[PDB]
Design an enzyme around this catalytic site. Sequence first.
Site, PDB file in Angstrom:
ATOM      1  N   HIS A  41      -2.741 103.028  80.554  1.00 13.33           N
ATOM      2  CA  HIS A  41      -3.690 103.787  79.731  1.00 13.33           C
ATOM      3  C   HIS A  41      -4.773 102.883  79.087  1.00 13.33           C
ATOM      4  O   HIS A  41      -5.619 103.385  78.332  1.00 13.33           O
ATOM      5  CB  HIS A  41      -2.951 104.642  78.688  1.00 13.33           C
ATOM      6  CG  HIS A  41      -2.201 103.871  77.653  1.00 13.33           C
ATOM      7  ND1 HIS A  41      -2.815 103.272  76.573  1.00 13.33           N
ATOM      8  CD2 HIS A  41      -0.876 103.645  77.508  1.00 13.33           C
ATOM      9  CE1 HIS A  41      -1.898 102.699  75.814  1.00 13.33           C
ATOM     10  NE2 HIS A  41      -0.715 102.913  76.357  1.00 13.33           N
ATOM     11  N   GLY A 143      -2.771  99.288  68.563  1.00 12.52           N
ATOM     12  CA  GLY A 143      -3.086  98.009  69.156  1.00 12.52           C
ATOM     13  C   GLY A 143      -1.887  97.243  69.681  1.00 12.52           C
ATOM     14  O   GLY A 143      -2.065  96.208  70.346  1.00 12.52           O
ATOM     15  N   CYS A 145       0.216  98.244  71.973  1.00 13.10           N
ATOM     16  CA  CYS A 145       0.603  98.589  73.329  1.00 13.10           C
ATOM     17  C   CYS A 145       0.541  97.357  74.220  1.00 13.10           C
ATOM     18  O   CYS A 145      -0.365  96.524  74.101  1.00 13.10           O
ATOM     19  CB  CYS A 145      -0.297  99.698  73.863  1.00 13.10           C
ATOM     20  SG  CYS A 145      -0.026 101.244  73.004  1.00 13.10           S
TER      21      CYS A 145
END
Lengths: 305, 305
Positions: A41, A143, A145
């Site tokens: 993503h 942030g 991820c």
Amino acid sequence: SGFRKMAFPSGKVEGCMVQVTCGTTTLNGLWLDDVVYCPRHVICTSEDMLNPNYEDLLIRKSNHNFLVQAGNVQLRVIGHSMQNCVLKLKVDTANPKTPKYKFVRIQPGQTFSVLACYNGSPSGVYQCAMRPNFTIKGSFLNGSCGSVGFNIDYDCVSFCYMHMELPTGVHAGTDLEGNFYGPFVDRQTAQAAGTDTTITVNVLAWLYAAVINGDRWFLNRFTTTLNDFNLVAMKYNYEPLTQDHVDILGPLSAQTGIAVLDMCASLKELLQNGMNGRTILGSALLEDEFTPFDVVRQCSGVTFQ
Amino acid sequence: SGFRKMAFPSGKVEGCMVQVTCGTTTLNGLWLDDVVYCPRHVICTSEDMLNPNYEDLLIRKSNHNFLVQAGNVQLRVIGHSMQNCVLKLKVDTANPKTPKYKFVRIQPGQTFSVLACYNGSPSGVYQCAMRPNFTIKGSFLNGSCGSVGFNIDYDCVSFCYMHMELPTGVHAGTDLEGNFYGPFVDRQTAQAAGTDTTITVNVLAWLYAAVINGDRWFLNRFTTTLNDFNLVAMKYNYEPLTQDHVDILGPLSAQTGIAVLDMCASLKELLQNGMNGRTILGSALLEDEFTPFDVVRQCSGVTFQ
Ligand SMILES: O=c1[nH]cc(-c2cc(-c3cc(Cl)cc(OCCc4ccccc4)c3)c(=O)n(-c3cccnc3)c2)c(=O)[nH]1
Ligand SMILES: O=c1[nH]cc(-c2cc(-c3cc(Cl)cc(OCCc4ccccc4)c3)c(=O)n(-c3cccnc3)c2)c(=O)[nH]1
């Protein structure tokens, strides 16, 4: 003496964290040999998130649209591909700090260390466990991820976890092949976790840790059977205990002289009567994120390098 | 979301751990620039420990009696000196992995990360706090002496802790200048800890962390005063709260909209009535090893490199 929630030393993984930017999105990637791994993503905008068609969105991305920064080392992207829910970016430089590693898909109940990172920079390390509903109870902000979970066997890093926070505040992610743990999908759409049960074999391991450390007040005069204990586990939303679990607890049984089924009878009494305002290893509840291996490592001092 | 016992990333410190051997004793040292720091009882035998005269024992040691191994890097010792309770070994090679660092003597209530090491090899990392009686509740086995505690501000490592386990199973050690925290001496002779009280300002910080995360059941309709609250703290073996502590909690107060004195009134009710079988941030007791800075860092995601 003492018993702590103890993570593996993170240095081997710190050298692998990079920042990955695509358009306006920035998250963390894992740089191993000449490949960078990150959640797919990264190619989405906040609007794309509601119903993303990742194959279609990837059509409009070329190598030069992915910016990879290793600290201030700027990495040249020479290929990209999507494997399940992770992006794999081929770069023209092998990471000189790559440790010996493997990718592993862990089972519920297994523990691992998390290195929480932001903008490619490590910020802290902690322990957690794959819950039986395939979430983890992490500590993550926007942030984070692409932060990874891992174990270390001597010199080899076993990466087991890399994606999202559910509306309930628990966390979902993939193995390093990009397959989610449990039924979650990388889309902002209704997803609910499922029953969070307690990892019975880990609780028993932690009671053995307590005995080894001198916390013995919960030992009682009783024993039980596997079937009788499991009737109690079911009532208290504990996972069933199997003969395989009994065998895994064998070494702790042998160290302490307490048969596994006697320890089950102590746990049964704790589940039926509570702790009566007492504590075990500094906790007022039954701890279930130490594996039998965790207990032996910390009570025997195995080391990694 | 989520709140975890979170250590700093340990990589900067892993590169500094070495093994120090003197005769038959082996423990851990800290290699920074061209100096190795270790506990001075490396020169003792088990018999020396009952009443060691370290100055006299050091007379019989020369540079070549100290063996220092950095992984398999063998270091040449070109000088040695005793500073309070630490040995400082001058070696002929500067550690190429030396981070930016400082030595700091922390106050009770302050937290730090511990990298537990054995034979010079890191084995795990965890968080703990300097207790008000100047012990720490660590997790250490034989061979762990010379393991260090630290904090990290962006790129600078602040070393604050390095020695022994008391018969009660808690731990005592020095700052990196070799002065023990509290009244302990490096001798196997009767030493008892002193009252272990609870770090009040840290508990309040953790209640603010809980509110930020949505655990709000303990918020009540009441307020109190500094003097009235401190009468309650004294009854429950809590440290007194000062105006300085109130100011340190100001930023969390401003983030949540809960005046510090209202949060004190919630803590007062929790101390007088207990948690009634409920939990806060996954705990059934009041947690006191998160500082206000710990809470802000983890709820804001500050990063280090
Ligand atoms: O530049 C960036 N944009 C976005 C992120 C990011 C993205 C997400 C994210 C990503 C996806 Cl496909 C879906 C998603 O919602 C799905 C879960 C869900 C279901 C139902 C309702 C709501 C939500 C969430 C996220 O959780 N987080 C997050 C937040 C807190 C803790 N952990 C992760 C971060 C990022 O690091 N960088
Ligand atoms: O080759 C080596 N020999 C010895 C050690 C070592 C030495 C000690 C040690 C060192 C000294 Cl001066 C004194 C001492 O007893 C003092 C405390 C005390 C008071 C009263 C009665 C009994 C004890 C203990 C130790 O605790 N430990 C230890 C054990 C568990 C956890 N942490 C530290 C280890 C070592 O790493 N290497």
